Amino acid sequence: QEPIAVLGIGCRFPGGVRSPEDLWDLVDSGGDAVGGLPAGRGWQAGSALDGVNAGFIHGVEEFDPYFFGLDPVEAAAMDPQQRLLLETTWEAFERAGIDPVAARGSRTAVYAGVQFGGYPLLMREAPPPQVLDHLGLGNSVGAASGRLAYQFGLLGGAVTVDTQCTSSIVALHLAVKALRNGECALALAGGACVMSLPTVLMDFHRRSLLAPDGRSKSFAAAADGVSLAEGAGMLLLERLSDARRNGHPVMAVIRGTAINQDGATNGIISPSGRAQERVIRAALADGRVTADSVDAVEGHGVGATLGDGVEVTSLLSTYGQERPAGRPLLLGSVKSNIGHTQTVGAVAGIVKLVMALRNERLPRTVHVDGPTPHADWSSGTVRLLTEPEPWRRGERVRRAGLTCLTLSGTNGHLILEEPPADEP
Amino acid sequence: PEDLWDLVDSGGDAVGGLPAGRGWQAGSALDGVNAGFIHGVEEFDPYFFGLDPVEAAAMDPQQRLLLETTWEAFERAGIDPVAARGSRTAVYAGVQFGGYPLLMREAPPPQVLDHLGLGNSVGAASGRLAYQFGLLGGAVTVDTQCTSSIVALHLAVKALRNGECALALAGGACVMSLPTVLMDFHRRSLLAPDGRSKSFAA
Amino acid sequence: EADGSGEAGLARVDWDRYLTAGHRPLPYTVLETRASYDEEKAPGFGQNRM
Amino acid sequence: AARPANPERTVPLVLSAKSPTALREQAERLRATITAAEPVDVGHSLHTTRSSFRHRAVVLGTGREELAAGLDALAGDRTADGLVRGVARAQGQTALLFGGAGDGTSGDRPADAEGPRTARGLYEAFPAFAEALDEVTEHLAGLLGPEVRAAVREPGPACAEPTVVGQAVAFALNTALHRLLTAFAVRPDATLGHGAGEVAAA
Amino acid sequence: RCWLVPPEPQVSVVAAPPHPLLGTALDLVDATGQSFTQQLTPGQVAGVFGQQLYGTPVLPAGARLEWLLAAARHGSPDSAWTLTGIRLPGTVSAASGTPVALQTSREDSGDGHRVRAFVKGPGTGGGRWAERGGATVVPAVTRPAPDRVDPESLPEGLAELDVAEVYRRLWRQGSDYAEPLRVLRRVWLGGDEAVALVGTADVPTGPSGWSRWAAVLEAAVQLAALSGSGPRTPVSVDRLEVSGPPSEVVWLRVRHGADGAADAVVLSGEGVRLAAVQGLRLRPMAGREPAGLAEAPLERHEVVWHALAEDGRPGAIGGGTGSWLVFSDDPERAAAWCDELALFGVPAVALAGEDAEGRDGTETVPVGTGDPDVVGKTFAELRERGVTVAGLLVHDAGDAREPASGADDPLDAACRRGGRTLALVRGFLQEYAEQTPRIVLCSAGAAAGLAGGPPHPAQAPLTALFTSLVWEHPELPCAQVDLDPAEDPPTVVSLLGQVMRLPGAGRLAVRGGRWFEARLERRPAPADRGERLALRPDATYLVAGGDTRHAAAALE
Amino acid sequence: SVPGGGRPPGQALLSALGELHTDGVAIDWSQAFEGRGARRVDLPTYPYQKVRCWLVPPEPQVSVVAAPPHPLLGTALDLVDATGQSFTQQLTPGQVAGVFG
Ligand SMILES: O=C(O)CCCCCCCCCC(=O)c1ccc[nH]1
């Protein structure tokens, strides 16, 4: 039950976002980032991607090899995912106000969410003989968490994890438990997702799973399909007591966390629904936070036609029973502005809620023509945030939750709170 | 465990010749290389676990060995797997991407193509165990090269101590579907020329 | 083949043609597998519809 | 263990498999282990550390020499006394038939003494039966006088003969065997009673 | 920039997909005419070779005809074409899992626009390239043709058939078609012509553009073969003329008016002429050799007895639907089983042969006279009493005729046993088959290969008569049970019980308390044992009882 | 019959229940062992009935030349109507600098 402080966040997200401040400008202006296929990647796609729209990091094919002390040959051999984590971790220490030279030798742990991106399969020819020697460590999933710790000279634990889309919420749960266990002094948690090969967009298009206009219309009645997008992000964490001893900034406090599987039984009982209703209870208990005290939730909201309805049902079964008068649970999802973001969906959500706390407003969910008919809104105890509302500091401590789901059956929840923010 | 004890107590070793039966396109690039193989990793029993044989052909051999080895673990733990369904058991597997779809010298049949995804994504290897046995705990895969097994144990020990779960399953798998890691270790001359790990000897 | 060989022979035959040639509306357990029985299967991994 | 001494009472040894050939291979494995451990400990293990699949077999024997002959009979697939085989169909669908004393006077009356004269041996053989029979027997004595207690201990021809003592012993033994079957977890969906013994079915 | 592969151009050509039989053109510098080459991988073969003859994959005749048209039209945008003097030797075939090389060429004839095309089939290993089709090409057809004909006017002279029986007729001609080539949707046939409705003929590359002609032309072969009898395959066509790609529906007409040759015309849904074919001959390859084309190996086939140790419990007899008839060589056995069926509440009647004594109050039947009429005139009397029959048991005494007659002749005994059993069984089938009775033949010591004593040869007509029923009255359920000839016979409720668990037909046997069932099963045959064999030199050998053709080969 | 069976009185009841267990009833055998000296032991695990499950059909064990094509001469064609042999190569951009020294 020690609270864990987010000291700083760094990220790259669709539509030219490079900082938490940029993501705020994008959501508060109600824009969306989904666009055309990238040029400049080696993609010789057939007719199979004609009309496919998605969210891409423009410029992932560019890097600055000299700043991190690499040979340009090695910088070419590395998976784009390893490079985004490395570039984002420097930005994470800088906004946290820590000198990377003072971080050397620290008991900082690393917990990275990464999935194998297939990068060397772009080659038509056999590789040049100088590149070949670097291709092993350049593309192994286990090397991604090791490289960060070598570059920044960190001496704590280092792990790469994979759990499909929940990989960032699972990485963050391990980092929170590590800091509470007393294993490490700081912890670095996050992930990356970059489409070096087109094959995942082709696999979703062949099965007709994508929305036709490429929008994840989160919780709306339109509900046409999902939308794949890229993204990368790192959070730096420390125990709240140690953060206040040193005098580092606190942007938000992580209070409680949980993970579960949705098991295996007949789909008629809604097994993924029962799984969410246990995982929320577990996360509230881990943080010792009462279910009336949460104001809002950054829902998974991917736009799958039944799945958003199972999520809305699970929230009514779990939060929607004990609401104070005039305090109905506000629901939204960042996937509406930037697409699904695959492995980093939890970081995108945390950046939104961290910026919402700092600016005393909750942003609207875009493209909501009317609420989804697959769940019962008749309690009035839960609603979509269809016009933005104020969220002032005051006598009630502000709190919010995040959810992530995936088809392999992992589910999770996090609770966030205000910084204590003592007067200057 | 008893087979390992018989080998070890009789003072033998188990490094030998390269596998037949796997479809390997290794020319002279593995000539004279010796290594330790699981014979018959290409053979499996789909009807026991409830898989149609085309899905059982789509799966990476690493997902198959973990699934087989888990049943044997429960049968010695004295727990009937039918009694374990609905338990708060967590799964932590040390696993790596095996490249198994790259064995195919041609585009696959359209029946197997739609199963290769969850057949070969590393993050499926935790979830599929939890599905087959109906386990409700957290289910993660970890990778840090050789140490991926200690990392899985450490996270499982810390999960049980913190009261997250009632049981935990921790371990890993490694199979050479493709020859390429042996080709490169031979190319850079890292292998002993007689193939033995002379562990601390002169 | 000293004993226990039964009725035994040597030829090129495809029995799936043979039992469908002429015509036959009911099973014949000398060539056909005897019967079905009560068992059930899961909807597969990843699939979670309805 | 502080393990008690005993006479060589029969052991029920249970095997199950998901297909027929696997049952026969399981008998060849287990036949090499019943030689080392005591049969009561092997039977207690297989009842509890294993699942209950669709293809089934049961072997009965007093000791190691008989049980080995049963497992060999399964392994070669040949019928022998004390071996039973079959394929389960999952539905419950069970009913239980009860009868009065006096119908044993209709014909072959000494066989309806010899059944009850055999049935007395169950009192030493099983824990659940003795307490049930004793509870009924001491409960009946207050309606009848002491001679019913001798009659339950000496179940001769009275069990076949239309008499108050005969009907009392018949109700006692039927009630006791019903508690025996429910201790073995057989649960009836229907009951039928023939003649004056209908009270037992009720 | 830090990336492995340099970036793609802002604009590029579509690089259109090749037709799978002709592949990508070669670029030899000095060559007199164009050539093209392909390898089919073992996975691709099943999509291109859409037809099976006797299990082996073969290339459809409409596909060879389209291959020549695709080879012809490669150099020009022109929408109408003509092929003449078309010849298609042999069968293109590919044994399961093998590679298939293909090659094709074009040569200018020097006669203005006239060009020659050829196709050559797989060279591999010690084998060499061989011709598999040739045609002459004349471009720019540039001639008028008839005005529209209403497709709905065409069928009136002919009966309609179910498309299921159309493909079953082709199955009885050795041929089966994969789903992409099952393009028929309605068919009419009779006399010297046929007409048909053809769906979207969507071969590989066929969902749009010219390639759809492969399966439209193959429908003309399917329909042309449907009119004949005995297996046959296309060999020549004298003209093919085509304009445009075929519409999503087309109508075919096929006629047999030329001496040994078909003509065919393809019409659009609007009644426009799409293509025509003249002088289509199958007759020069009527009845070509299946034994060289069949996929199956030489194997050893054996009737193996499996115990019913799994599920071996009798189950109930099927209720009071009608009586059971019991006939036996022994009046005491017939009576005993009629007493047993009475204890179980099943109605039964006892029958005996009229050369046996009427010892135990049975009916009597003239079995022993070889004639089904006098037997039938006896069974008809039971129907006139109002008796109804569920089934019939015939029980044989086994070796007991040997000590009873006091002399041995197993071949005369077999002649008698056949004659008796035939008289009973035929006589019964004539009188009751509309009731769907069940027939059970109960031999003893007839089953081969089982343990416990030798088989008795005089039983053999019973196993023959059982299989003689199974294929000739295929709607009637029946079974043979073979008893042990020396152990005591089982309770009749056990026999009938286990037999009522079989729908259809089967062979069962009893030895001890076990029930067994026969299955015909297969294993590889080591013919190389004979390749190592030589017979001993200091001996004589007999070849006996054969004709000239068998004897000459035995002597060889 | 539940009381009736073979001569030892326990074998009758255990066989009668054994047939019900065999047919499918979920019988709890623990009363046969209760009050007796029973322990627990490690026993052999389930015997799998394995079959080949692999994407690729097994390759034939034939020896062949390791790298036969010469960098300029390339592949020899088998054009059927040819008067004499012709050979072709395409060089990819990364090969060109290796052959052109
Ligand atoms: O820690 C050590 O000393 C052991 C090093 C072993 C590294 C093995 C990495 C294997 C990754 C294979 C892979 O990611 C792949 C193969 C084909 C396509 N991708």
E164 φ, ψ (degrees, to nearest 5): -60, -45
Distance of CA F70 to the CA centre of its chain: 41
**Spatial separation of the C-alpha atoms in residues D52 and D49, rounded to whole Å:** 10
In angstroms, the Cα distances linking E469 to C16, E395, E397, E474 are 20, 17, 22, 7
DSSP E389-407: EEEEEEE--GGGHHHHH-S
- Which residues, 6 or more positions from A106, have their beta carbon under 8 angstroms from its beta carbon? A154, A155, A156, A185, A186
Residue to test with chain A: of E3, E11, E208, most A Cβ within 10 A:
E3
HEC string of F2-22 equals CCCCCCCHHHHHHHHHHHHHH
A312 and A372 Cβ atoms separated by less than 8 Å: yes
| Least Cα separation, residue A125 to chain B (angstroms) | 16
Question: Which F residues, 1 through 60, put their C-beta within 8 Å of a C-beta on chain D?
Answer: 2-4, 6, 8-15, 17-41, 43-44, 46-49
Which amino acid is residue F51, in one-letter code? V
Q: Which two tokens stand for residue A144?
A: 């991604």
> Quick check: is A424 in a domain?
no
Of the candidates C8, C13, C23, the beta carbon closest to that of E296 is on: C13
> Quick check: is A114 in a domain?
yes
- Touching status, chains B and F (3+ beta-carbon pairs under 8 Å): yes
- With contacts defined as CB-CB under 8 Å, which chain B residues touch E43? 106-109
> Quick check: is A371 in a domain?
yes
Residue to test with chain E: of F20, F22, F80, most E Cβ within 10 A:
F80
Looking up tokens 């840090």 gives: B144
Which amino acid is residue F9, in one-letter code? P
Residue of D119, D126, D199 whose CA lies nearest to D152: D119
E505 and C26 Cβ atoms separated by less than 8 Å: yes
Phi-psi region of E269 (alpha: psi -120 to 50; beta: other; left: phi over 0): alpha
Task: Find the helix packing angle between B61-77 and B124-133, rounded to 10°.
Answer: 40
**Spatial separation of the C-alpha atoms in residues A202 and A210, rounded to whole Å:** 10
> Quick check: is A119 in a domain?
yes
Task: Find the length of chain A.
Answer: 424
- Which residues, 6 or more positions from B118, have their beta carbon under 8 angstroms from its beta carbon? A407, A408, B124, B128, C45, C46
> Quick check: is A145 in a domain?
yes
In angstroms, the Cα distances linking E467 to B164, B174, E460 are 68, 57, 12
**Spatial separation of the C-alpha atoms in residues A170 and E352, rounded to whole Å:** 85
- With contacts defined as CB-CB under 8 Å, which chain C residues touch E54? 14
Q: Is the CA virtual torsion F94, F95, F100, F101 positive or negative?
A: positive
Which amino acid is residue A242, in one-letter code? D
A204 and A53 Cβ atoms separated by less than 8 Å: no
Which amino acid is residue E243, in one-letter code? S
What residue in E sits closest to B110 (Cα-Cα)?
E43
In angstroms, the Cα distances linking D82 to C42, D29, D86, D185, E553 are 37, 19, 14, 22, 58
Hey, is E524 helix, strand or coil? strand
**Spatial separation of the C-alpha atoms in residues E441 and E421, rounded to whole Å:** 9
Q: Which two tokens stand for residue F82?
A: 């040819």
Contact across the interface for B127 and C45, Cβ inside 8 Å: yes
E271 and E148 Cβ atoms separated by less than 8 Å: yes
Q: Which two tokens stand for residue A77?
A: 């051999």
DSSP C26: S
- The span from the first CA to the last CA of chain D, in angstroms, equals 44
Q: Which two tokens stand for residue E213?
A: 């002609």
Looking up tokens 């298609």 gives: E88
DSSP B75-130: HHHT--TTTSTT--EEEEEE-----GGGG-SSPPPHHHHTTHHHHH-TTHHHHHHH
Neighbours of A40 (CB within 10 A): 15
Buried-state track F42-77, b at ≥16 Cβ within 10 A, e below 16: ebeebbbeeeebbbbeeeeeeeeeeeeeeeeeeeeb
Residue of A292, F8, B50, E4 whose CA lies nearest to D53: B50
> Quick check: is A423 in a domain?
no
Neighbours of E226 (CB within 10 A): 19
Q: Which two tokens stand for residue E148?
A: 């529209």
A155 and A106 Cβ atoms separated by less than 8 Å: yes
- Which residues, 6 or more positions from E324, have their beta carbon under 8 angstroms from its beta carbon? E341, E346, E347, E348, E349, E389, E390, E391, E392, E393, E496
Q: Which two tokens stand for residue E12?
A: 């590029």
DSSP A342: G
Resolution in A: 4.0
> Quick check: is A277 in a domain?
yes
**Spatial separation of the C-alpha atoms in residues B100 and B125, rounded to whole Å:** 14
Neighbours of E85 (CB within 10 A): 13
D101 and D158 Cβ atoms separated by less than 8 Å: yes
What residue in D sits closest to B84 (Cα-Cα)?
D51
**Spatial separation of the C-alpha atoms in residues A230 and A88, rounded to whole Å:** 14
Q: Which two tokens stand for residue A304?
A: 């799958």
| Least Cα separation, residue E331 to chain D (angstroms) | 30
Q: Where are the beta strands (DSSP E) in D68-194?
A: 83-87, 95-99, 190-194
Q: Residue C34, class by beta-carbon neighbours within 10 Å (0-12 exposed, 13-18 middle, 19+ buried)?
A: middle
Q: Which of A132, A139, A140 to mutate to test the pocket of ligand 1 (most atoms within 8 A of CB)?
A: A140
Q: In what side-by-side order are the strands of the sheet with E51-53?
A: E56-58, E51-53, E175-177
Q: Is the CA virtual torsion E15, E16, E17, E22 positive or negative?
A: negative
Question: Which D residues, 29 through 48, put their C-beta within 8 Å of a C-beta on chain F?
Answer: 29-30, 33, 37-38, 40-48
Give me the residues paired with residue F31 across strands: none
B54 and B112 Cβ atoms separated by less than 8 Å: yes
Instruction: Name the CA dihedral angle for E29, E35, E41, E45, rounded to a multiple of 10 degrees.
Output: 170
Which amino acid is residue A87, in one-letter code? E
Phi-psi region of E225 (alpha: psi -120 to 50; beta: other; left: phi over 0): alpha
Buried-state track E456-487, b at ≥16 Cβ within 10 A, e below 16: bebbbbbbebbeebbeeeeebbbbbbbbbbee
In this structure, the strands spanning E193-198 and E250-258 are antiparallel
**Spatial separation of the C-alpha atoms in residues A312 and A307, rounded to whole Å:** 9
Tally of structural domains, chain A: 1
Residue of B99, B70, B111 whose CA lies nearest to B177: B99
Hey, is A291 helix, strand or coil? coil
In this structure, the strands spanning A361-362 and A186-193 are unpaired
**Spatial separation of the C-alpha atoms in residues F89 and F76, rounded to whole Å:** 9
Q: Which two tokens stand for residue A150?
A: 């070598």
Q: Which of B178, B182, B184, B185 to mutate to test the pocket of ligand 1 (most atoms within 8 A of CB)?
A: B178
E80 φ, ψ (degrees, to nearest 5): -135, 140
- Which residues, 6 or more positions from B193, have their beta carbon under 8 angstroms from its beta carbon? none
- Which residues, 6 or more positions from A413, have their beta carbon under 8 angstroms from its beta carbon? A257, A258, A279, A280, A282, A283, A401, A402, A403
Q: Is the CA virtual torsion A119, A125, A131, A137 positive or negative?
A: positive
Phi-psi region of E321 (alpha: psi -120 to 50; beta: other; left: phi over 0): alpha
In angstroms, the Cα distances linking E459 to E165, E403, E465 are 41, 16, 11
Hey, is B167 helix, strand or coil? strand
- Which residues, 6 or more positions from D111, have their beta carbon under 8 angstroms from its beta carbon? D104
Pocket of ligand 1 (CB under 6 A): A 140; B 96-97, 99, 145-146, 178, 181
Hey, is A212 helix, strand or coil? coil
Alpha-helical runs (H) found in E138-231: 163-171, 213-226
Looking up tokens 């190691």 gives: D64
Neighbours of A173 (CB within 10 A): 27
Neighbours of A109 (CB within 10 A): 25
**Full domain range(s) for residue A138:** 4-417
Residue of A43, A48, A27 whose CA lies nearest to A352: A27
Q: Residue B74, class by beta-carbon neighbours within 10 Å (0-12 exposed, 13-18 middle, 19+ buried)?
A: buried
Phi-psi region of B190 (alpha: psi -120 to 50; beta: other; left: phi over 0): alpha
In this structure, the strands spanning E389-395 and E323-328 are parallel
Question: Which B residues, 130 through 189, put their C-beta within 8 Å of a C-beta on chain A?
Answer: 130-132, 134-145, 148, 151, 155, 158-159, 162, 184, 188
**Spatial separation of the C-alpha atoms in residues B38 and B176, rounded to whole Å:** 9
E446 and E463 Cβ atoms separated by less than 8 Å: yes
In this structure, the strands spanning A399-405 and A296-298 are parallel
E300 and E522 Cβ atoms separated by less than 8 Å: yes
Q: Which two tokens stand for residue B170?
A: 């921790």
The residues on F that touch B, with CB distances below 8 Å, are 40, 42, 45-46, 48-59, 61, 64, 66-67
E222 φ, ψ (degrees, to nearest 5): -55, -50
Q: Residue A299, class by beta-carbon neighbours within 10 Å (0-12 exposed, 13-18 middle, 19+ buried)?
A: buried
E461 φ, ψ (degrees, to nearest 5): -60, -25
E351 φ, ψ (degrees, to nearest 5): -125, 150
Q: Which two tokens stand for residue E243?
A: 């304009």
D75 touches chain F (CB under 8 A): no
CATH of the domain at A180: 3.40.47.10
Expt. technique = cryo-EM
Residue to test with chain D: of C33, C34, C36, C39, most D Cβ within 10 A:
C39
Rounded (5°) CA angle A237-A243-A246? 135
Neighbours of E213 (CB within 10 A): 27
Q: Residue C50, class by beta-carbon neighbours within 10 Å (0-12 exposed, 13-18 middle, 19+ buried)?
A: exposed
**Spatial separation of the C-alpha atoms in residues A364 and A389, rounded to whole Å:** 8
**Spatial separation of the C-alpha atoms in residues A290 and A256, rounded to whole Å:** 12
Give me the residues paired with residue E392 across strands: E325, E439
Contact across the interface for F9 and D119, Cβ inside 8 Å: yes
Element (H, E) at D164: helix D164-183
Looking up tokens 């340099």 gives: E6
Contact across the interface for C46 and A407, Cβ inside 8 Å: yes
C49 touches chain E (CB under 8 A): no
Q: Which two tokens stand for residue E338?
A: 């009629």
- The span from the first CA to the last CA of chain C, in angstroms, equals 59
> Quick check: is A188 in a domain?
yes
E371-380: long-range pairs with CB below 8 Å, 24+: E371/E423, E372/E422, E372/E423, E372/E426, E372/E427, E372/E430, E373/E427, E374/E427, E375/E423, E375/E424, E375/E426, E375/E427, E375/E428, E376/E427, E376/E430, E376/E431, E378/E427, E379/E427, E379/E428, E379/E430, E379/E431, E379/E432, E380/E431
Distance of CA E125 to the CA centre of its chain: 34
Hey, is A6 helix, strand or coil? strand
